[PDB]
Amino acid sequence: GKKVVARVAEARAEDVGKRVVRVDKAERAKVGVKVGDVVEVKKV
Amino acid sequence: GKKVVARVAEARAEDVGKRVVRVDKAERAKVGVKVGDVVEVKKV
């Protein structure tokens, strides 16, 4: 299966309407990431 | 390693300033996802 290498970012005003995966504070604590960290996005 | 189960969403105006992973059209084609699809986010 293919996957996307990406970085946690702070959504910008120009990002409205664009496709994103939201990662809230609790989810970030679980994964152990802060803004700027590299993550992998995989299709389920 | 822990991972987050999430869904591709359309960023809202209230999402500005919040942490997201941006997935553009090309990236979505690679992963094979559309808005509404379940994905897994893993820390690298």
Author numbering:
A (entry chain A), B (entry chain A): 5 to 48
Publication text:
Here, we study fold transition between distinct β-barrels by protein engineering and structural biology technique. Here, we discover that the previously reconstructed ancient DPBB sequence could also adopt a β-barrel fold named Double-Zeta β-barrel (DZBB), as a metamorphic protein. The DZBB fold is not found in any modern protein, although its structure shares similarities with RIFT and OB. Furthermore, the reconstructed OB fold could also be converted to the four-stranded SH3 fold by a simple circular permutation. Thus, these ancient β-barrel folds (DPBB, RIFT, OB, and SH3) could be readily interconverted by a few feasible mutations through the missing-link fold, DZBB, indicating their significantly close evolutionary relationships.
The most simplified DPBB protein we designed previously, design-1 (mk2h_ΔMILPYS), did not fold in the typical buffer conditions (50 mM phosphate, 150 mM NaCl), but crystallized under two different conditions, containing malonate or malic acid ions, and adopted the DPBB fold in the crystals. Here, we report its third type of crystal, formed under different conditions (100 mM Tris, pH8.5, 20% PEG-400, 200 mM lithium sulfate). Interestingly, we could not solve its structure by molecular replacement using the DPBB fold as a model, implying that design-1 had adopted a different conformation in the third type of crystal. By molecular replacement with the predicted design-2 model (RIFT fold) and subsequent manual remodeling, the crystal structures of design-1 (third type of crystal) and design-2 were determined. Surprisingly, they both adopted into a unique β-barrel fold that topologically differs from DPBB and RIFT. Compared to the homo-dimeric DPBB fold, the directions of the β2- and β2’-strands were inverted, resulting in all anti-parallel strand patterns like those in RIFT. However, the 1st loop connecting β1– β2 was rolled up, unlike the simple β-turn in RIFT. As this loop configuration resembles the letter “Zeta” in the topological scheme, we named this β-barrel fold the Double-Zeta β-barrel (DZBB). Therefore, design-1 can fold into two different structures with an identical sequence. Design-1 exhibited the metamorphic property, adapting two different folds, DPBB and DZBB.
